[PDB]
Paper text:
The killer immunoglobulin receptor (KIR) family, which recognizes HLA class Ⅰa, is another group of inhibitory receptors on NK cells. The KIR family consists of single-pass transmembrane receptors, including inhibitory receptors with long intracellular ITIM domains (designated as “L”) and activating receptors with short intracellular domains (designated as “S”).
Lirilumab is known to bind to KIR2DL1/2/3 and KIR2DS1/2, while Pan2D binds to KIR2DL1/2/3 and KIR2DS1/2/426. Soluble Pan2D IgG also exhibited similar agonistic activity against KIR2DL2 NK-92 cells (data not shown). These results indicate that the conventional anti-KIR antibodies lirilumab and Pan2D possess agonistic activity against inhibitory KIRs. However, lirilumab and Pan2D scFv also exhibited agonistic activity against activating KIR2DS1/2 and KIR2DS1/2/4, respectively, enhancing the cytotoxic activities of NK-92 cells. Fab fragments and scFvs of each antibody were used for crystal structure determination. Unlike HLA-C or Pan2D, KIR2DL2/3 agonist 61 Fab bound only to domain 1. To explain the selectivity of KIR2DL2/3 agonist 61 in detail, we prepared homology models of KIR2DL3 and KIR2DS1/2/4 and evaluated the differences in the epitope region. Meanwhile, some amino acid differences from KIR2DL2 to KIR2DS1/2/4 that could cause steric hindrance or loss of hydrogen bonds may impair the binding of KIR2DL2/3 agonist 61 to KIR2DS1/2/4. These differences were expected to have little or no effect on the binding ability of Pan2D.
Numbering used by the authors:
A (entry chain L): 1 to 214
B (entry chain H): 1 to 136, 141 to 223
C (entry chain K): 24 to 107, 109 to 163, 167 to 224
The structure:
């Protein structure tokens, strides 16, 4: 029951930046039995640093580890694009061995404006009784954004679902999809459907609307 | 050299049991311990327990004392984990790992690729593919809506794999129905809408469904 | 100020077999009406009992069992005269160990179980399991094990010395991530020392 808390939960750095992240234990941990792992989405965790400071095989020298007692740290001297991943700390000083909540390292870039598009429900889907309206926010940065659905200028709630991509390999941007699911009869009741998007790099919230007819 | 091959993705119903494997190669299976970890989506790793295949001796996390059963078969160099009284909370990706040395506390050096177990009363169902209209100067957006499918693995390509630029395939979202839904979009030059036929290829191997849908400017 | 510390003893002993019970008695001359037993370890807990008074001694018997891993750890006892609780100074610590959770090691004598007086005896405790340390008891010494040896064994040598006088020895294995969790006991080993003719 040695609880490992990692700070910060998420951070972003530019290429060439110095990165540092902390792992705090509720009880004292022997330095020989604190380990760091790097995990990228879809693959298994990889041993990165063993026994506080020693780098595992195949780990660049820009990485380093330090700490004792209750506080430990992982540091990157100059950020590289390959370094963007989630890093976990792990103690095996006392069983049960425990892992931290992880710290997600991302690549920081210049602000990018979201290209907003709106897609109406297909004719084939309307024939089956359900109506899905899709709003797309394409290639923006930073990740924080808000999508408000207005049906006949009426804000909606409980009928929307958002999905965000991970950072692009080239753009380092995100993209968001907000899908609104309504009944076919409920869809045919109201006229105008609009998607309102607010984000940095947009001077004012941008609205993309369409009329149910054509 | 050292490799850990875990069993494939498995779907199990609530209240039943599931058993997954972890096969070792490249080292004397008997000389080292084996650890099992649980990782729910978007969280850290939980240690389930450990087993020493030479003795088949075990040491379980108190949290998973009645949940998991760890066994080992030396003739096949394979470790097994059996989860009982399955809940939706037991849906996660489970890993097996071998430490650096025979000491079970040394760093978890080698890692299996993980087994994804989905626990749901939901129905194995093919996906419904609806077009996302270009809906007209510049670059337009166009996509496909892959809706109401289970289980999770779904594949989307464009023009049989000849359209890689501009594609964004969003992660699936779990609906209240218990079925999944994602959308794959792509930005294309507005001039090519009349010249080029853009189609999306969706594949859902669990239901053995393959769908090709033409996405065209239309009203 | 604060009352004196109670006495904490374990009957029948400090080493407990799995699924068995042990009685941790806590007694003192001060007329403590309440006794509190606290365990530090994997699953920390505090148990409360009321103390009986007999022959000017207040005491309470705590029943730890059936023995599990969560019940192993360091125990300390506290006494209190009042409730709603002015706890006394803590007792001397007792390390309650659960045994019998892993395969038993082998205990051997070098050069042999019986030697002439003055000849050296070294007890070797070995096992095919990767135990991190071994504990030798004569009816308690801990020595760390060594890496992969003959037959892949992990081993620890306990030299008895010139004037050991012998006895019956047992050996336990243990891992360093769980200090209070020991293996099955090795088979007893009678070490006899006879005089030189
Ligand atoms: C504790 O146990 C011992 C041994 O059985 C007994 O003699 C003693 O009276 C007990 N103390 C109590 C019951 O307070
Ligand atoms: C411990 O010893 C008992 C009795 O000799 C035996 O039944 C049990 O299987 C042993 N446990 C282990 C883990 O070796
Ligand atoms: C190694 O194992 C063999 C086969 O079990 C045994 O006969 C021999 O005594 C062992 N040697 C040791 C423990 O040194």
């Amino acid at each position: 029951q040695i609880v490992l808390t990692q700070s910060p939960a998420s951070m972003s750095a530019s290429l060439g930046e110095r990165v540092t992240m902390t792992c705090t234990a509720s009880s004292s941990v022997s330095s020989s039995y604190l380990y760091w792992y790097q995990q990228k989405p879809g693959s298994s965790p990889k041993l990165w640093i063993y026994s506080t400071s020693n780098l595992a095989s195949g780990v660049p020298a820009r990485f380093s580890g330090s700490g004792s007692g209750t506080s430990y740290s992982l540091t990157i001297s100059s950020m590289e694009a390959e370094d963007a991943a989630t890093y976990y700390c792990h103690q095996y000083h006392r069983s049960p061995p425990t892992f931290g909540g992880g710290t997600k390292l991302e690549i920081k870039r210049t602000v990018a404006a979201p290209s907003v598009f709106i897609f109406p429900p297909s004719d084939e889907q309307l024939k089956s009784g359900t109506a899905s309206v899709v709003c797309l926010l394409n290639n923006f940065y930073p990740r924080e954004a808000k999508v408000q659905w207005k049906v006949d200028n009426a804000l909606q709630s409980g009928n929307s679902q958002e999905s965000v991509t991970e950072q692009d390999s080239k753009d380092s941007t995100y993209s968001l999809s907000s899908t609104l699911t309504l009944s076919k009869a409920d869809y045919e009741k109201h006229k105008v459907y609009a998607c309102e998007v607010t984000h940095q790099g947009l001077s004012s919230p941008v609205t993309k609307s369409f009329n149910r007819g054509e | 050299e050292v490799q850990l091959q875990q069993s494939g993705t498995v779907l199990a119903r609530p209240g039943a049991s599931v058993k997954m494997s972890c096969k070792a190669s490249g080292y004397t299976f008997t000389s080292y311990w084996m650890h099992w970890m649980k990782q729910r989506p978007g969280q850290g790793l939980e240690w389930i327990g450990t087993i020493y295949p030479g003795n088949s001796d075990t040491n379980y996390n108190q949290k998973f004392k009645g949940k998991a059963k760890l066994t080992a078969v030396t003739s096949t160099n394979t470790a097994y984990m059996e989860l009982s009284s399955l809940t939706n909370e037991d849906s996660a990706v489970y890993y097996c790992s071998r430490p650096t040395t025979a000491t079970r506390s040394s760093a978890m050096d080698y890692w299996g690729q993980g087994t994804s177990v989905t626990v749901s009363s939901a129905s194995t169902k093919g996906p419904s593919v609806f077009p996302l209209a270009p809906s007209s100067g510049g670059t337009a957006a166009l996509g496909c809506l892959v809706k109401d499918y289970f289980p999770e693995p779904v594949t989307v390509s464009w023009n049989s794999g000849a359209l890689t630029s501009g594609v964004h395939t969003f992660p699936a979202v779990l609906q209240s129905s218990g079925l999944y839904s994602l959308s794959s979009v792509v930005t294309v030059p507005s001039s090519s809408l009349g010249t080029q036929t853009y189609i999306c290829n969706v594949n859902h191997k669990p239901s053995n469904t393959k769908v090709d849908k033409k996405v065209e400017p239309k009203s | 100020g604060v009352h004196r510390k109670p006495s904490l003893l374990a009957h029948p002993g400090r080493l407990v077999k799995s699924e068995e019970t042990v009685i941790l008695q806590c007694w003192s001359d001060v007329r403590f009406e309440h006794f509190l037993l606290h365990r530090e370890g994997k699953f920390k807990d505090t148990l409360h009992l009321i103390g009986e008074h007999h022959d000017g001694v207040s005491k309470a018997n705590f029943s730890i069992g059936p023995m599990m891993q969560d019940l192993a750890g360091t125990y300390r006892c506290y006494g209190s005269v009042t409730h709603s609780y002015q706890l006394s100074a803590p007792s001397d610590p007792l390390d309650i160990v659960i045994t019998g959770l892993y395969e038993k090691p082998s205990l051997s004598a070098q050069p042999g179980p019986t030697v002439l007086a003055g000849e050296s005896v070294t007890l070797s405790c070995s096992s095919r399991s990767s135990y991190d340390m071994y504990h030798l008891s004569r009816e308690h010494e801990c020595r760390f094990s060594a890496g992969p040896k003959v037959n892949g064994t992990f081993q620890a040598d306990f030299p008895l010395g010139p004037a050991t006088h012998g006895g019956t020895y047992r050996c336990f294995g243990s891992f360093r991530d769980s200090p209070y969790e020991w293996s099955n006991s090795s088979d007893p080993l009678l070490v006899s020392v006879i005089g030189n003719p």
